[PDB]
């Protein structure tokens, strides 16, 4: 749709301000190294010369710590046991995998927590016997709230010597919530307590993994065909190479940029150059993408080696230009879950506009609540709700035959592409703000909003919108491939 030279110029500008802003972030991090070390105790390693890591991130440091401790070995064991079952006798593979999942859950959490998962699953199963979608949703919500209660938190903390084990239990149960809620809703020979235990205690996605729809699990696990061992080895080698590359990139961004430390000390964030501000925003979202690439590629890798078909991994968030697009592609598993359940049952967009505005509102309320329900999560979800609704309304208005005919009459398609990118610039300028509010908390979002739009209304806003305009042109040009079909 565009002359090659124009697209090349847009792409060069896009990579230009990404790398320039990263350079600004790197310089700022270098300048304040001593203060951050004395404040947030930057870690030390020999991975990259004399650089000192910034482990103020919680998910990354936590998951890497565990991966070293136990999870990597247990995943290797799961791989070995899966291959052994497939070779000796595949007829009993599902139950062998279930037993291995129970044993691994016991090893990393002991009986206190395997019992908790079993109790949650059993209660969900019994409630499912009543066969009422409302009952199942209420049971899942109440179980999640119990996970969020205080006395429950204290009793759980009592059992575990190290807090990290308690947080692992919290994440495991937060995801079991979705897994057994999915199964219970589907229930409302295939559906028996043995199958539900097989699904819940599936080790690859036990702790924090892509939400694997029960349909795929039952269909492919019950399958009677598999690839050769040589193909499995080749896939394992390639997947492990890609995972190592992704982990190396995550470590590179952790070392070069102290983005997390800069976001922890709000006073610094409010006195840096605006180029550094945009660089910090982009570095934050890109580090999050790499983190949920590394963490979601290991379960995905294992399930690929088991013959399962996992949800597609997130697509680089430097080519995402919309609330709906990156709600569809970044988190594929959760998106499929939220569409099939949660959204459709309430009514969705097939019954009146109010129906759409309430189905989307309820979906986003549940999504915010699931992540934990803190205040900043509610703000991020409200921002996303407004963005998604506004975008859907604009798309509907454009799709009207009169509007389409007028646009064709007046604006050339080459021109209408420029208008599309111009709108995408604002949409993305709010897409990054919502993500910043989700990551750094309300204060970071307020600092960005004051510094960029209000305090810099004359020219800073225009500069940001122009750079996001080039960004949107590149993003739409790339996304023209997959989005169409």
């Amino acid at each position, epitope marked *: 749709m565009l002359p090659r030279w124009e697209l090349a110029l847009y792409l060069l500008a896009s990579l230009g301000f990404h790398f320039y802003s990263f350079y600004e972030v790197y310089k700022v991090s270098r300048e304040h190294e001593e203060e951050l070390d004395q*404040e*947030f*105790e930057l870690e030390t390693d020999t991975l990259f010369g004399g650089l000192k890591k910034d482990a*103020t*991130d*919680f*998910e990354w440091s*936590f998951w890497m710590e565990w991966g070293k401790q136990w999870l990597v070995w247990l995943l290797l064991g799961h791989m070995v046991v899966s291959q052994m079952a497939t070779l000796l006798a595949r007829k009993h593979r599902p139950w062998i995998l279930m037993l291995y999942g129970m044993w691994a859950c016991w090893c990393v959490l002991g009986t206190p927590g395997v019992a908790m998962v079993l109790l949650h699953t059993t209660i969900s199963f019994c409630v499912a016997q009543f066969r009422s979608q409302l009952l199942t949703w209420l049971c899942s919500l109440l179980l999640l709230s119990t996970l969020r209660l*205080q006395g429950v*938190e204290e009793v759980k903390r009592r059992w575990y010597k190290t807090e990290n084990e308690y*947080y692992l239990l*919290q994440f495991t149960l937060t995801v079991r919530c979705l897994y057994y809620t999915n199964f219970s809703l589907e229930l409302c020979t295939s559906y028996s307590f043995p199958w539900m235990l097989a699904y819940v205690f599936y080790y690859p996605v036990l702790h924090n993994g892509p939400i694997l729809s029960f349909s795929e699990f039952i269909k492919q696990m019950q399958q009677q065909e598999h690839d050769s061992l040589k193909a499995s080895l080749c896939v394992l080698a390639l997947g492990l190479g890609r995972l190592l590359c992704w982990w190396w990139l995550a470590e590179l961004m952790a070392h070069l940029m102290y983005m*997390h430390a800069i*976001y*922890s*000390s*709000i*006073p610094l964030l*409010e006195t840096v150059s605006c180029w550094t501000l945009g660089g910090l925003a982009l570095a*934050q979202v890109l580090f*999050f993408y790499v983190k949920y690439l590394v963490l979601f590629g290991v379960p995905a890798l294992l399930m690929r080696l088991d013959g399962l078909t996992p949800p597609a991994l997130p697509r680089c968030v430097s080519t995402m230009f919309s609330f709906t697009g990156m709600w569809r592609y970044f988190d594929v598993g959760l998106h499929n879950f939220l569409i099939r359940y949660v959204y459709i049952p309430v009514g969705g967009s097939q019954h009146g506009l109010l129906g759409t505005l309430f189905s989307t509102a309820m979906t986003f309320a549940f999504v915010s609540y699931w*992540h*934990g329900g*803190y*205040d*900043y999560l509610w703000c991020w979800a409200a921002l996303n709700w407004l963005g998604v609704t506004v975008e859907n309304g604009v798309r509907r208005l454009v799709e009207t035959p009169c509007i389409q005919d007028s646009l064709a009459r007046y604006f050339s398609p080459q021109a209408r592409r420029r208008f599309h990118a111009a709108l995408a610039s604002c949409s993305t300028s709010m897409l990054i703000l919502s993500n910043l509010v*989700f*990551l*750094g*908390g*309300n*204060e*970071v979002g307020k*600092t960005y909003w004051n510094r960029i739009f209000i305090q810099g209304w004359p020219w800073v806003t225009l500069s940001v919108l122009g750079f996001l305009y080039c960004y949107s042109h590149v993003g739409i040009a790339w996304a023209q491939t997959y989005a169409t079909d």
Partner: nanobody
Amino acid sequence: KSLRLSCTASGAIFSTYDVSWYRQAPEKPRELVAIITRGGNTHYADTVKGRFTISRDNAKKTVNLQMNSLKPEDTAVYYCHAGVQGAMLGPRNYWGQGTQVTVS
């Protein structure tokens, strides 16, 4: 005279916690009194605005609530609460033990 409360975290990176001060009068739910975030931003409950001052010092990892012009209602149990804000920092949340405050 006036009473000065405190909440001194230990073994924690206190530069990021958004400490708070919840008070629970008997036969009533726990209610927010004063919250001080990690950027210095301060917020107060409507009933106790101006009279109450909340301050913090990251150097010593301490918080301090200054209650002035006490009234018979203020008698309650005051709970600290050190919770983070942001998906990078995580789901940290450490309610304090709590302490008793009484007048008349």
